RNA sequence: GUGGAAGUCUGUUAGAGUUGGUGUCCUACAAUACCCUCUCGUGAUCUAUGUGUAGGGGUGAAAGGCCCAUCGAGUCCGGCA
RNA sequence: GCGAAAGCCAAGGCCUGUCGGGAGCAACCAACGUUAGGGAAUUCGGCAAGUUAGUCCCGUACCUUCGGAAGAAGGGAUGCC
RNA sequence: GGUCUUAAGGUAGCGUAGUACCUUGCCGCAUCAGUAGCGGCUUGCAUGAAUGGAUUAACCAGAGCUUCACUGUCCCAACGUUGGGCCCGGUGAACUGUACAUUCCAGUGCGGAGUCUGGAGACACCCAGGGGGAAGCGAAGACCCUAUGGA
RNA sequence: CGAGUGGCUUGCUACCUCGAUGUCGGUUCCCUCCAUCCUGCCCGUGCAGAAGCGGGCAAGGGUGAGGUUGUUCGCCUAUUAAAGGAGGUCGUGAGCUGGGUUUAGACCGUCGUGAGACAGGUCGGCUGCUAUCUACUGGGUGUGUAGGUGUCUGACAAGAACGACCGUAUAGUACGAGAGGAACUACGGUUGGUGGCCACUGGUGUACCGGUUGUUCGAGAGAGCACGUGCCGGGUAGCCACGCCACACGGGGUAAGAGCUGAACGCAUCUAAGCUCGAAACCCACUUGGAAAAGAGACACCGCCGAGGUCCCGCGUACAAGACGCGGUCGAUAGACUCGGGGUGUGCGCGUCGAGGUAACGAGACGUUAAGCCCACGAGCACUAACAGACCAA
């Protein structure tokens, strides 16, 4: 699997899946990304993110 | 009851206010008790995903308000672990009113539902829109 | 009314004092069923990681599916039975009769023992067989030790010595079996005793935490509400009633917590291999890099990294063995981060 | 709009007070203290110095409060062993 | 900055609110920071702690001795160049 | 009862009151559940007109209650920060002490014993702890009664 | 109607304490009793089943959460296998709390001429002490057994280390007209308790990195202070629970009870002698401690002029002193350096762009730059430091 946030590969037997109000699903490979997302930031604008890279 | 096929960290207690994910006319539910649960001195009875809890209607249509009904926890904010080690959490805490036979009192279920809830309450499941 | 409530903490692991030996001593052994064999082995704790397995349980609605399982990595290099100890039955229990030693010793066994320079193996053997003829021969065990030098991440070279029992078919047969192992050089491995999928009992001296309060040590509550601001936060209500006018030892008080022996039951051996397939990236924190004989124990194992841990075929298993579980993935992701 | 009234408001301005923490202290730093919190803060206001009222008497927006750590009748010595 | 406010800094003063050395420095205590999910279930009681907050614009109920209630409530804005 | 004591015989109001014994009065509101709170009723053990009654805007570190918000008050505790605590040099008290004293279980005794009796346990010294017991320490009991006591 | 047991209530008595044995309720923590609320095994039934009712053995475990009230009690709600009662100075204030009872202030009702009273109500109204002895939890130093190292034994000691529930198959079956509706057994899970552990999730993380407000160092750069981080964002190790792992069965003897053989009493009889079974209870099993067990243990090897140990040095798998464990050049024990692995999130400077502005000036954007900064971890590596050396010992 790939993190729906930064885009790096999520290590099997690791991560959290957030289920949105509407029903949508977002797999995070870490708290770091979850938290950066909750800050309203977009992975594309963060230079450390593979997405952005 | 039947194995949920997932480990849960009760994210609710007696007295917690949650969302009524159905069209029964009840918007807000207050947890009163947790089926088949006995606690320990000082511990607040706890409930989570897949538990059948007794509830009272806090908000909604006048006829539904103050009524003490039965219900099934369909979503919680606290995470739950699936066989493959991943955690899963939702955007809110919600339950669906049910009857003696555990058939949803309503006609429609609002929002998504955890798959695990299926392996326990079929009719509730076969009434779901989205099942994550 | 005062609602009921279980007492705080088990009274079955006391006195909660520091452990006499950092090396665990089993006080029980498996029964004499199968063929003759040594009933245990030892290794050194390294750290933890997870592995993905194929549901092996025939009764699980998930049998055959992927499944993530935690695992403790333990370095289990070969050990060496350096002698065969014989016990005789007497009106006062068992007592050591004699011992049969060898001549081939590991270069650094003398860091612990006054290695034998003159021993009569045969005479001992004789004495043992006579005892057996007379029918006073009690169980048979082998004095064993490890080779820390074989494990780099572990500072110590001084080997740890422990006696392990040998259960086998007939006394005569396993006696011989014992002598054979010893005579060689006593060198044996995890493979010779355990097979992946079997349940073993893991003993070990837990991580030490020094002196601790009741709350952490026995799990008593903390003062609540207003009581928490008066001057008391982590001390119990009282040491007891007026009468008996003494303090009972059953009341939770402060003391040494940690560094106690514990024999954790029914631990499944997920896999016994060798190499660096289980090592994590960056190295096992505060331990090092694994690359050699290893065992993967499902779940946790008492003790801190580097501590000696012992294995024994489970004495009271609940499930039947389900050999060689399919391991589809072993995480090597760094434990840092 | 001007004017700028008030036993008026906010306010750790200075100053005055002392509600809760039943906190800290309780052979104290202290025979009434420390901290946070809190009340008043242009008025029946607070305050220095000077001055008047003396013991069954003063003084008292009154609690039997206060009159030099002494008050339902100060303190000292005497009656008094 | 509204300010004799905070906070920071001059001038001036001080290192004398006058015993020190050592242990990642344990239990326990005093002051205190942060705690997921729940949110007063705690308790005699929300005690303690917390929330809110400055300024401008919009807007403001019952009641009323017409003074008031009222900063009611509620909504929005707020930097730098 | 359809007058009598002793002059009159409770009016407007307010009322289960900070006054109501019976009492958690009855009904309602509110809550899952409310000896609470508020409203109505009210025969008021034993309300009531300057011994002032009713009522009331504003004010209040005054008493009771409900809601939103908030949160380690709680579920149920964790980690951390500073000063102690612990070890070392220096300084250096007090409380308290009939004697003896390593005690525990029972018994007995002026009926609440480390010291009697019977048993049981018990090698000596020291460090740290939290305070079960010494009916622990502190104060010739404020309560009660007594005194041909005091004010 | 009669005979009792208990010592929880109430009353009675006035033995003990008035040079004081701190109150009620609550809390917290520990032990116990059985007259048993649930759970195990049973008997009877007005026992078809299912659900009950009553009774026997039995104290292993459990007996919870909330609304009014200071309340105990109790009333009420929803859960529950059940939400049992009682003793320990009505256990527990040198532990807490202080709402109530019961000080000084005050109000109301009643009573009183009045001071003032109330077995009436109400608002406010303080919690002292540095542990000598003893007790227990944990930690050391000595002596005894009578040189050292390593490994054991096991008298005895502790445990609840496990208690309970739901679901599936059995089975819509036995039973029953039907409605309804079991079991043995085998499985999956939950709960409460217990011990341990941190790969995973989560908390912390005043290590660290970044953003940013005020002010000071002239600006810049880089910094200090704003309580022991100014605030905000992220967060490694470690420590943790809200996270994860593990915690039987089965034998042996019994109770209540079901029976066998069997006599006194030719029969009968589960009992008198004998025997077979049979409880969550008892014993073992399993876990923990345990040579100071005075019968003070056993074995193997080393040593008595030398085995081994202490001090020393570098450190922790240990740790409040002490203890413990490891390494000491025949070396990777700690540091430096370099890698690996990690945290932040793109450095200074310079170049280009930039709303504009004559210009000065210019917030900010892009590039150089996964940059710069940082690490309580790992590896490589004898470069530095584990040197020198002292002592005890049959
Ligand atoms: Cl409940
Ligand atoms: Cl408490
Ligand atoms: Mg409670
Ligand atoms: Mg206090
Ligand atoms: Mg990690
Ligand atoms: Mg990660
Ligand atoms: Mg004023
Ligand atoms: Mg003011
Ligand atoms: Mg004057
Ligand atoms: Mg008075
Ligand atoms: Mg004087
Ligand atoms: Mg929280
Ligand atoms: Mg409450
Ligand atoms: Mg409560
Ligand atoms: Mg407050
Ligand atoms: Mg009323
Ligand atoms: Mg007296
Ligand atoms: Mg009196
Ligand atoms: Mg008089
Ligand atoms: Mg006392
Ligand atoms: Mg009985
Ligand atoms: Mg018991
Ligand atoms: Mg008592
Ligand atoms: Mg009690
Ligand atoms: Mg006291
Ligand atoms: Mg006490
Ligand atoms: Mg004290
Ligand atoms: Mg009071
Ligand atoms: Mg009161
Ligand atoms: Mg009062
Ligand atoms: Mg002697
Ligand atoms: Mg600072
Ligand atoms: Na305090
Ligand atoms: Na205190
Ligand atoms: Na007492
Ligand atoms: Na005018
Ligand atoms: Na004050
Ligand atoms: Na006088
Ligand atoms: Na005189
Ligand atoms: Na000085
Ligand atoms: Na009157
Ligand atoms: Na006032
Ligand atoms: Na806190
Ligand atoms: Na004591
Ligand atoms: Na006395
Ligand atoms: Na009490
Ligand atoms: Na029991
Ligand atoms: Na109650
Ligand atoms: Na008492
Ligand atoms: Na007290
Ligand atoms: Na008390
Ligand atoms: Na049995
Ligand atoms: Na001995």
Swiss-Prot record, chain A:
Compositional bias annotation for Basic and acidic residues: 44-53
Cofactor binding comment, as recorded: Binds 1 zinc ion per subunit.
Gene Ontology terms for molecular function: rRNA binding; structural constituent of ribosome; zinc ion binding
Coiled coil: none
Cofactor entry: Zn(2+)
Cellular component GO terms, alphabetical: ribonucleoprotein complex; ribosome
Zn finger intervals (C4-type): 3-33
Keywords: Metal-binding, Ribonucleoprotein, Ribosomal protein, RNA-binding, rRNA-binding, Zinc, Zinc-finger
Similarity section: Belongs to the eukaryotic ribosomal protein eL24 family.
Function recorded in the entry: Binds to the 23S rRNA.
Record-given protein name: Large ribosomal subunit protein eL24
UniProt source species: Haloarcula marismortui (strain ATCC 43049 / DSM 3752 / JCM 8966 / VKM B-1809)
From Swiss-Prot, chain B:
Keywords recorded for this protein, A-Z: Ribonucleoprotein, Ribosomal protein, RNA-binding, rRNA-binding
Sections of the chain in a coiled coil: none
GO cellular component: cytosolic large ribosomal subunit
PROSITE patterns attached to this UniProt entry: RIBOSOMAL_L14
Keyword rRNA-binding appears in the UniProt entry: yes
Keyword RNA-binding: yes
Annotated InterPro entries: Ribosomal_uL14, Ribosomal_uL14_arc, Ribosomal_uL14_CS, Ribosomal_uL14_sf
Highest taxon, organism lineage: Archaea
PANTHER family xref list: 50S/60S RIBOSOMAL PROTEIN L14/L23, LARGE RIBOSOMAL SUBUNIT PROTEIN UL14
Family in the record: Belongs to the universal ribosomal protein uL14 family.
Protein name (database record): Large ribosomal subunit protein uL14
Lineage, broadest ranks: Archaea, Methanobacteriati, Methanobacteriota, Stenosarchaea group, Halobacteria
Gene: rpl14
UniProtKB/Swiss-Prot annotation, chain C:
One GO CC term on file: cytosolic large ribosomal subunit
Main function: One of the primary rRNA binding proteins, it binds directly near the 3'-end of the 23S rRNA, where it nucleates assembly of the 50S subunit.
HAMAP family noted in UniProt: Ribosomal_uL3_A
Protein name according to UniProt: Large ribosomal subunit protein uL3
Biased composition annotated in UniProt, kind: Polar residues: 21-30, 246-258
Organism: Haloarcula marismortui (strain ATCC 43049 / DSM 3752 / JCM 8966 / VKM B-1809)
Region (Disordered) residue spans: 1-43, 150-169, 205-258, 311-337
Record's keyword terms, sorted: Ribonucleoprotein, Ribosomal protein, RNA-binding, rRNA-binding
Keyword rRNA-binding annotated: yes
GO biological process, one term: translation
This protein's encoding gene: rpl3
Residue stretches of biased makeup (Basic residues): 219-236
Family indicated by similarity: Belongs to the universal ribosomal protein uL3 family.
Lineage, opening ranks: Archaea, Methanobacteriati, Methanobacteriota, Stenosarchaea group, Halobacteria
PROSITE patterns listed in its UniProt record: RIBOSOMAL_L3
InterPro entries recorded: L3_arc_euk, Ribosomal_L3_dom_3_arc_sf, Ribosomal_uL3, Ribosomal_uL3_arc, Ribosomal_uL3_CS, Transl_B-barrel_sf
Subunit structure: Part of the 50S ribosomal subunit. Forms a cluster with proteins L14 and L24e. Interacts weakly with protein L13.
Keyword Cell wall biogenesis/degradation: no
Gene Ontology MF, one: rRNA binding
Domain of life of the organism encoding this protein: Archaea
């Amino acid at each position: 699997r790939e993190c729906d946030y930064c885009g790096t590969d999520i290590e099997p037997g690791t991560g959290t899946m957030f289920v949105h109000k509407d029903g949508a699903t977002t797999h995070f490979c870490s708290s770091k990304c979850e938290n950066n997302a909750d800050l309203g930031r977009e992975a594309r604008n963060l230079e450390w993110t593979d997405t952005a890279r | 009851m039947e194995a949920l096929g997932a480990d849960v960290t009760q994210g609710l207690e007696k007295g917690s206010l949650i969302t009524c994910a159905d069209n029964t006319g009840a918007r807000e539910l207050k947890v009163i008790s947790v089926h088949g649960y006995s606690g320990t001195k000082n511990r607040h009875p706890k409930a989570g995903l897949g538990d059948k809890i007794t509830v009272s209607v806090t908000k909604g249509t006048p006829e539904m308000r103050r009524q003490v009904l039965e219900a099934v926890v369909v979503r919680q904010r606290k995470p739950i672990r699936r066989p493959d080690g991943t955690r899963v959490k939702f955007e809110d805490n919600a339950a669906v009113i049910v009857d003696e036979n555990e058939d949803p009192r309503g006609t429609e279920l609002k929002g998504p539902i955890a798959r695990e809830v299926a392996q326990r309450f079929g009719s509730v499941a076969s009434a779901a829109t989205m099942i994550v | 009314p005062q609602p009921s409530r279980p007492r705080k903490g088990s009274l079955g692991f006391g006195p909660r004092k520091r452990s006499t030996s950092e090396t665990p001593r089993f006080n029980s052994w498996p029964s004499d069923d199968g063929q003759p064999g040594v009933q245990g082995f030892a290794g050194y704790k390294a750290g933890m990681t997870h592995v993905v397995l194929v549901n092996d349980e025939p009764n699980s609605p998930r049998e055959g599916m992927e499944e993530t399982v935690p695992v403790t990595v333990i370095e289990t290099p070969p050990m060496r039975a350096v002698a065969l100890r014989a016990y005789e039955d007497t009106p006062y229990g068992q007592r050591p009769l004699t011992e049969v030693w060898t001549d081939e010793f590991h270069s650094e066994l003398d860091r612990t023992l006054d290695v034998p320079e003159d021993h009569d193996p045969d005479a001992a053997e004789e004495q043992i067989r006579d005892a057996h003829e007379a029918g006073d021969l009690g169980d048979l065990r082998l004095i064993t030790h490890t080779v820390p030098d074989a494990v780099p991440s572990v500072p110590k070279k001084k080997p740890d010595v422990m006696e392990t029992r040998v259960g086998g078919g007939s006394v005569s047969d396993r006696l011989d079996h014992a002598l054979d192992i010893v005579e060689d050089g006593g060198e044996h491995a995890m493979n010779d005793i355990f097979r992946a999928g079997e349940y073993a009992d893991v003993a070990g001296v837990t991580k030490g935490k020094g002196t601790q309060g009741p709350v952490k040590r026995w799990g008593v509550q903390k003062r609540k509400g207003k009581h928490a601001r008066q001057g008391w936060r982590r001390r119990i209500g009282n040491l007891g009633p007026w009468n008996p006018s003494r303090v009972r030892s059953t009341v939770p008080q402060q003391g040494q917590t940690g560094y106690h022996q514990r024999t954790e039951l029914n631990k499944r051996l997920i896999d016994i291999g060798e190499g660096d397939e289980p090592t994590v990236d960056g190295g096992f924190v505060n331990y090092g890099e694994v690359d050699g004989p290893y065992t993967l124990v499902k779940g946790s194992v008492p003790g801190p990294d580097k501590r000696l841990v012992r294995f024994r075929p489970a004495v009271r298993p609940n499930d039947q063995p389900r050999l060689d579980p399919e391991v589809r993935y072993v995480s090597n992701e760094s434990n840092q981060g």
